[PDB]
């Protein structure tokens, strides 16, 4: 199945409170495999997974370095962005980026991205082709001409097409179990009394791994996701998650309602009724 | 275009002298540098920047400092100058790893600014044997007694610079524990040599002290000069 | 972070194939490069390897092949041409926008020469008395002009030269001493065909 290895970078200037906070987080798929923090006691790239243990002290040191570079590397950006917009010092700002790629079973490269986010609104980014850049505002204009008149596109393109990939593989080589493991959600339902001879039926799902899941309520073979009630998935806070949904149904009319839990770690979707 | 202007390109400075070399660009490349070309070590990194203000240490830091005022002007600064800092300095702009280097700078700081000597060059002439025996005419050009090898020897036939059949050892050789020496061998034909009209000139641009330097002597000043020898086409008989 | 050009000097016969060794140490895919430097100008880039095809095709018949197993980015050009005699440097980009160059390699491509006319001459400086010198000339690239163990008696290094018409690919080494009438004939011990200063009428 498709897989990824994206990198999340963020530098936020805290004028006065010192030098900007900078840190990058590594994600092979949606698991956190490595991060680095400026406000760290001992700044150093840190292994956010047992298996990352198989990576040498050299690896750490290496990226450790590479990081610190990018550290002051972004420090610059900040100034530069500031100048470009005509805004004087003072307002703490946040630069963020997502650089990454996506290989799929055959190893072919599905997608490569590098996107610059300034203070929360799209700055610039490398198009699908991996050759041009797209930017908003007369300012971000100045920036493209730069990255292009320097080869950036190309050099970037190599990382994505070659580096992130060769590595993404390696990571998977050793992270497998941890990344390929499953945990079947545990569901149940609840009856919540309510005025006007009606009750709230809530379908609980929790203890499941892979964070993607779908829940649905039915009344004899018909979807009710419509006037239903949902909650963004809850990090169960222990390598697993939680999610529920519910709907109002006349009292007594419970037995006629059914919830469905479809989750990739389930041979047969889960089916509950009251 | 994308020019890496590196000035000055040469200097004979004194020990304990504060020398600053500047580098102007037009590549818009945020990443600027200062490397040092010295034998047995090739080039080496002194200092580097990422844009105005951004400044960090390279691998050869001792004694060197740097400034980044414009997205253009970069500059390696030596205050407590010592001859160890003698070398060809190179700076450069760069995006990710596409370094665009510059012309260079011959850095010669010394213990005594008096130990010097503008080149003493003289023009020799073609061995008639070569002349007759082979119908061409080599006319080597020697240069002696000079201190800062910041020299470049060119040829000047009938009024224009030469490159046709011209070869100079790029590196001047050790004459004495101090006098360097340089040589080259222009070689034109017989027909051409044998014409009292077509002229031959030999020029050795030399680089030492400039206008405001300390020349604590009552003797001739050894500044950037151009001492040269001359010859002419001799007959055939 | 480490680079190595085992041999800083290699001389080759013009035409022939050229391969300059280069090793590097860094447990990861660095950014390797090769710059050229000839007389006075600074460096010049030939190519760059970021990632991708281990075989890079660059400017002027110059190409290299990246390799792992035990590191390398050996440069390569098959039809060497005189003008290529120079200093080729191999750089890497380790922990950020830096370029950790390695020692380097001065290559020398001796030209081809149809006619070995190892004739020695003697030239006198027209602007003074006894100001002569010994000029070795037009000899065979593959040869070796003797060294100096005589003070004041200096011999330069083989300095190939080329004119505008035909060839003239000629080596040549200048010599001069402050020692009495020494004969070029003498100084160039193991050399050939010396013609003296005896201006014949015909």
């Amino acid at each position: 199945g498709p897989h990824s290895l994206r990198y999340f970078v963020t530098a936020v200037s805290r004028p006065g409170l010192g030098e900007p906070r900078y840190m990058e987080v590594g994600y092979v798929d949606d698991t956190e495999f490595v991060r680095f923090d400026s406000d760290a006691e001992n700044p150093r790239y840190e292994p956010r997974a047992r298996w990352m243990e198989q990576e040498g002290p050299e690896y750490w040191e290496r990226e450790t370095q590479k990081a610190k570079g990018n550290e002051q590397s972004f420090r610059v950006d900040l100034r530069t962005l500031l100048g470009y917009y005509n805004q004087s010092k003072g307002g703490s700002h946040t630069i963020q980026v997502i650089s990454g790629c996506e290989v799929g079973s055959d190893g072919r490269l599905l997608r490569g991205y590098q996107q610059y986010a300034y203070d929360g609104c799209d700055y610039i980014a490398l198009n699908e082709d991996l050759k041009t850049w797209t930017a908003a505002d007369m300012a971000a204009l100045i920036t493209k001409h730069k990255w292009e008149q320097a080869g950036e596109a190309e050099r970037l393109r190599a990382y994505l097409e070659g580096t992130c990939v060769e590595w993404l593989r390696r990571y998977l080589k050793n992270g497998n179990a941890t990344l390929l493991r499953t945990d079947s959600p545990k569901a149940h339902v609840t009856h919540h009394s309510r005025p006007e001879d009606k009750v709230t039926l809530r379908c609980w799902a929790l203890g499941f791994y892979p964070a993607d899941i779908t829940l649905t309520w039915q009344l004899n073979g018909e979807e009710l996701i419509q006037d239903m009630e949902l909650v963004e998935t809850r990090p169960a806070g222990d390598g697993t998650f939680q999610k529920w949904a519910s709907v109002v149904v006349p009292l007594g009319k419970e037995q006629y309602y059914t919830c469905h839990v479809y989750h990739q770690g389930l041979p047969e979707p889960l089916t509950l009724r009251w | 275009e994308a020019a890496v202007t590196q000035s000055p390109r040469n200097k004979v400075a004194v020990t304990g002298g504060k020398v600053t070399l500047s580098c102007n660009q037009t590549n818009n490349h945020n990443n600027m540098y200062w490397y040092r070309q010295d034998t047995g070590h090739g080039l080496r990194l002194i200092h580097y920047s990422y844009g105005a203000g951004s400044t960090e240490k390279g691998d050869i830091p001792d004694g060197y400092k740097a400034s980044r005022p414009s997205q253009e002007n970069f500059s390696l600064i030596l205050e407590l100058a010592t001859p160890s800092q003698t070398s060809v300095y190179f700076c450069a702009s760069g995006g990710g790893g596409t370094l665009y280097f510059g012309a260079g700078t011959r850095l010669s700081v010394l213990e005594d600014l008096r130990n010097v000597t503008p080149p003493k060059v003289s023009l020799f002439e073609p061995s008639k044997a070569e002349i007759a025996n082979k119908q061409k005419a080599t006319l080597v050009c020697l240069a002696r007694g000079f201190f800062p090898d910041h020299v470049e020897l060119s040829w000047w036939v009938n009024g224009k610079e030469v490159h046709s059949g011209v070869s100079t050892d790029p590196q001047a050789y050790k004459e004495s524990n101090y006098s360097y020496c340089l040589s080259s061998r222009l070689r034109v034909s017989a027909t051409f040599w044998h014409n009292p009209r077509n002229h031959f000139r030999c020029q050795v641009q030399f680089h030492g002290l400039s206008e405001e330097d300390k020349w604590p002597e009552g003797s001739p000043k050894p500044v950037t000069q151009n001492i040269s020898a001359e010859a002419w086409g001799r007959a055939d008989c | 972070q480490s680079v190595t050009q085992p041999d800083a000097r290699v001389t080759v016969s013009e035409g022939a194939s050229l391969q300059l060794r280069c090793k590097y140490s860094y447990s990861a895919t660095p950014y390797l490069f090769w710059y050229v430097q000839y007389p006075r100008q600074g460096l010049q880039l030939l190519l760059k390897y970021y990632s991708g095809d281990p075989v890079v095709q660059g400017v002027n018949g110059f190409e290299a092949e990246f390799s792992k197993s035990n590191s390398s980015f050996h440069l390569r050009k098959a039809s060497v041409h005189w003008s290529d005699s120079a200093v080729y440097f191999c750089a890497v980009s380790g922990f950020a926008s830096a370029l950790t160059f390695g020692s380097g390699t001065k290559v020398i491509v001796l030209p081809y020469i149809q006619n070995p006319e190892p004739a020695v001459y003697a030239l006198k400086d027209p602007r003074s008395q006894d100001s002569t010198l010994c000029l070795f000339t037009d000899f065979d690239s593959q040869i070796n002009v003797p060294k100096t163990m005589e003070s004041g008696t200096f011999i330069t290094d083989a300095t190939v030269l080329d004119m505008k018409a035909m060839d003239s690919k000629s080596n040549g080494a200048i010599a001069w001493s402050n020692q009495t009438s020494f004969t070029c004939q003498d100084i160039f011990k193991e050399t050939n065909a010396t013609y003296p200063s005896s201006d014949v009428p015909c």
Partner: peptide
């Protein structure tokens, strides 16, 4: 293994 980003 991460990239070596450029400025802006």
């Amino acid at each position: 293994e991460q990239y070596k980003f450029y400025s802006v």
